[PDB]
Write an enzyme that holds these catalytic residues in place. Structure first.
Site, mmCIF file in Angstrom:
data_model
loop_
_atom_site.group_PDB
_atom_site.id
_atom_site.type_symbol
_atom_site.label_atom_id
_atom_site.label_comp_id
_atom_site.label_asym_id
_atom_site.label_seq_id
_atom_site.Cartn_x
_atom_site.Cartn_y
_atom_site.Cartn_z
ATOM 1 N N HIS A 66 0.843 -1.201 0.000
ATOM 2 C CA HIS A 66 0.000 0.000 0.000
ATOM 3 C C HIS A 66 0.865 1.231 0.000
ATOM 4 C CE1 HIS A 66 0.239 -0.156 4.506
ATOM 5 N NE2 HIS A 66 0.208 1.166 4.423
ATOM 6 N N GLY A 89 2.150 6.710 9.255
ATOM 7 C CA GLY A 89 3.530 7.132 9.027
ATOM 8 C C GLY A 89 4.490 6.021 9.376
ATOM 9 N N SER A 130 3.648 2.799 8.485
ATOM 10 C CA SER A 130 3.465 1.729 7.485
ATOM 11 C C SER A 130 4.733 1.283 6.727
ATOM 12 C CB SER A 130 2.385 2.139 6.515
ATOM 13 O OG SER A 130 1.117 1.638 6.876
#
Lengths: 223, 58, 223
Positions: free
Chosen positions: C40, C175, C177
């Site tokens: 993602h 932030g 991820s």
């Protein structure tokens, strides 16, 4: 059923209507005391209506039996609709006959391209609202998995399959849930979900029955 | 109209958020991807992704 | 990271920051030329920042290398976030050293209860907004699958696991991820998704790395 035809009275003798003061879902008689519907169709105080044609008129072939118990699949996931299947036991045994018969369960999965029969008392419009009082039929094929997944990216599981037309125009719809998808005299699917009705590139999604035979058999034997 | 209890988001800057709410009869006139069940009454879910979701309902 | 501590400069040498004019995700150096992040986190024109501590100040241990290619997992599903993993090849090989090292890949899955280390430059508030400039650490355990599924019914797959605290207060956040979940000196997870941050009964959801080792190995060998 959108873009289908009038079955004709008692032409689909395994078809049942689930009633709770009104028809809210379909189902299939699998034996004298058990019906199979969609898990999303769960509700309490259900009455099963057999031998029906015009669900608003007593025509004299009907048998009305209350459910004595309902068992939703142990892994039904209401978020993704995985394992959308449920079993309902009748209060008393139905009397089987010409207009009231059960449908055979599959012994194997049907293949893409196979022609099936879908029936229901569901909405008759892709846009709009018009409910039939009599049973509607549709002939439709099983779409390939790859076609299914292109239509609904990220949502099709192994316990689902698409049937219908990519061009749209013909499909199952609201009020048809729980009903049968029959191919080669076997129950292969259960009307489940979709994106609108009869929309272009938005065929119907069905429960892959063949993946449940064992749980069915076992469950029925113990209750 | 758009609101959202169960909301799921990636932990990216910014987040791609979605609503895991299951509404009845339809999906918002603020939803691009509405999927429903074929029973009466229908159960629907709005699978759109957004850099945020909406606020609770009730 | 909510409720964590300041790692200390270069204490997590495999940690990378992904930059596109600003830090938008984390990642992990798995070798001299490849980083693993979250699918993602995909975007084009990415620069990888190694040896970082304060991402807003050049402290002189950094190596800034552009990505030459990115490969998202063939089955990444952006709707359910299944298979949330991606590989990034550096334009040139990093120079490995004390503050800049790779992390070992697992040879087996870690078990519930195991203590892991999670790090990131993510939001520091469950409610509100406050981004750190320096790397934050958190020690947290792997929750049982059954606990994971009770938290997020219908959403956890086999390629996911929960880590953290059911009581809340401590968690990964926006932030973070793409960043690492390290246990017993192996990369076991990748910060992925959740419901808010550090919420009660809403622990973090991570990518189960152990399920990807082969694809990793093969992919890297052919590119």
């Amino acid at each position: 059923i959108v873009g289908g035809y009038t079955c004709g009275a008692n032409t689909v003798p395994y078809q049942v209507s689930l009633n709770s003061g009104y028809h809210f879902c379909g189902g299939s008689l699998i034996n004298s005391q058990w019906v199979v519907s969609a898990a999303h169709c769960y509700k309490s105080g259900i009455q099963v209506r057999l031998g029906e044609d015009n669900i608003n008129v007593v025509e004299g072939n009907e048998q009305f039996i209350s459910a004595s118990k309902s068992i939703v699949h142990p892994s039904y996931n209401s978020n993704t609709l995985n394992n959308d299947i449920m079993l309902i036991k009748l209060k008393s045994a139905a009397s089987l006959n010409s207009r009231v018969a059960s449908i055979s369960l599959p012994t194997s999965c049907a293949s893409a391209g196979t022609q099936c029969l879908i029936s229901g008392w569901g909405n008759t419009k892709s846009s709009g609202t018009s409910y039939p009082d009599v049973l509607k039929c549709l002939k439709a094929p099983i779409l390939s998995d790859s076609s299914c997944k292109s239509a609904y990216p990220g949502q099709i599981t192994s316990n689902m399959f698409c049937a219908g037309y990519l061009e749209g125009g013909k499909d199952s719809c609201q009020g048809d849930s729980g009903g049968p998808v029959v191919c080669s005299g076997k129950l292969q699917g259960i009307v489940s979900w979709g994106s609108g009705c009869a929309q272009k590139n938005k065929p119907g999604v069905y429960t892959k029955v063949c993946n449940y035979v064992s749980w069915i058999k076992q469950t029925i034997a113990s209750n | 109209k758009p609101c959202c209890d169960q909301c799921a988001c990636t932990k990216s800057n910014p987040p791609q958020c979605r609503c895991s709410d299951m509404r009845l009869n339809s999906c918002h006139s603020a939803c691009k991807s509405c999927i429903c069940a074929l029973s009466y009454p229908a159960q629907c879910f709005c699978v759109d992704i957004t850099d945020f979701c909406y606020e609770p309902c009730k």
